[PDB]
Design a protein around this nucleic acid. Structure first.
Ligand SMILES: [Mn+2]
Ligand SMILES: [Mn+2]
Lengths: 255, 248
DNA sequence: CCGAATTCG
DNA sequence: CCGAATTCG
């Protein structure tokens, strides 16, 4: 990263399935090899567990790790040392979660710009639609509450079905979905695909856009440049890094 | 002055079924209704009814699996025709059973169904309700239309339908929503499914269409409230006994 | 035939 | 972490 790339923020968001203990160290090395290949400014992770933090410290040592909890499984935001200045961490509870989910925010400066970076792992499964929708509203409300000078980016595992966003009140007017913004490209539409991904060993073909990126922008100040899947290569053990694909996104901050 | 019972009698529960069928008919004998609408009849149950209720004309919604039936008291009700309308997307062999009958000079279209069960099949149940309500509108204006059956409805689902049309009435609502016969499926009062929690629903409902004030509900009561010798009820549902007057 | 939990394709 | 079928409370 040099002068030319200084207006861009790049990040990966990825549910890395730390609850699957099988082959986890190797799969963590797979995630870290991806991080090394693209060297993103920021990484948003879900289903991190404490052992996984140790793997990240070993094989992704150039990132500062901010976590959403201390025990069980939780989210994390990784910040590239030397690029990102950490200002503060905020955690917003989801009072009715049954899965210890919450909203993790880190305030940073990057590229001469102030950011509020947010991630969550919204309540899982079709059956918990109602709570997931309540959590989505919590997220969207927090995005709106940020000071107008701040650039707000949410990236996480939303577990959303398209009908559920409509139930919620849609995305608010100054909030956009990066995939939507980019014209709904087919190549990175599905982030969870049991036909292409066999980590869960589900003997059926279902696919969803569970992982999503929302950003807040007044008059063209944040412009998505690219969106691509990562984590689609089988590792030596014959399994993928996760049951999810990751998302690699680049956005330009414009005057 | 016409009377009927509608009742899901749970023929799918094999446990104590013979005793529970006899319990149903003991209850029917007490009230001697002009018409009985039944849901979850199975073939050996229907065979029983053909003997026990030989004084009724028995119309059935199917011949295999489980199905509805309408029983018509001979000498009181003249049977003119039956019609069965499919629910093309049912996963539970549900349909709409109609009979055209008369009582004296009064023509009736009597209808029953067992709408798709469980919260998860709400969308299909709503589509079926729309089919029922549509069919109710098709009878000539001089014909009195009565639907009585196990709708599995939640109140919110009727709203999603847009509400009952202006010329279709719920008999329980018509009588001022009496509390004593509100819930027809009640796991606090009924132990048949052995559900260790208290849930109650008005699943069984009566809709009617009649020329302005030609059909006037008089009473509505739960039946099947007494435990049998086996310590269980005739069904997990209570039945509904309704009496109405036709006023010309 | 509730609502939650679980198993299994 | 799908969804249909099943069991549990
Ligand atoms: Mn997961
Ligand atoms: Mn039943």
């Amino acid at each position: 990263k040099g002068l030319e790339d200084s207006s861009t923020i790049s990040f990966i968001t990825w549910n890395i399935d730390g609850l699957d203990g099988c082959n986890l160290p190797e799969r963590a090395r797979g995630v870290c090899s991806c991080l090394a290949l693209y060297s993103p400014d920021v990484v948003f992770l879900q289903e991190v567990i404490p052992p996984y933090c140790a793997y990240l410290k070993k094989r992704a040592a150039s990132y500062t790790i901010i976590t959403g909890n201390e025990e069980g499984y939780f989210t994390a935001i990784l910040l590239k040392k030397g690029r990102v200045k950490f200002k503060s961490q905020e955690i917003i509870p989801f009072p009715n979660t049954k899965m210890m989910r919450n909203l993790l925010c880190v305030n940073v400066s990057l590229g001469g710009n102030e950011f509020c970076l947010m991630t969550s792992h919204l309540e899982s499964t079709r059956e918990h639609s109602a709570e997931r929708i309540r959590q989505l509203k919590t997220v969207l409300g927090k995005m709106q509450e940020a000071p107008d000078s701040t650039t707000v980016i949410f990236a996480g595992d939303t577990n959303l079905r398209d009908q559920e966003v409509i139930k919620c009140g849609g995305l608010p007017d100054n909030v956009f979905d990066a995939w939507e913004f980019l014209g709904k490209p087919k190549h990175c539409q599905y982030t969870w695909d049991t036909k292409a991904n066999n980590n869960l060993r589900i003997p059926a073909a279902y696919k969803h856009r569970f992982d999503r990126i929302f950003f807040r922008a007044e008059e063209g100040h944040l412009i998505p440049q690219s969106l691509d899947l990562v984590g689609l290569e089988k590792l030596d053990c014959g399994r993928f890094p996760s049951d999810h694909w990751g998302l690699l996104c680049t956005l330009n901050v414009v005057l």
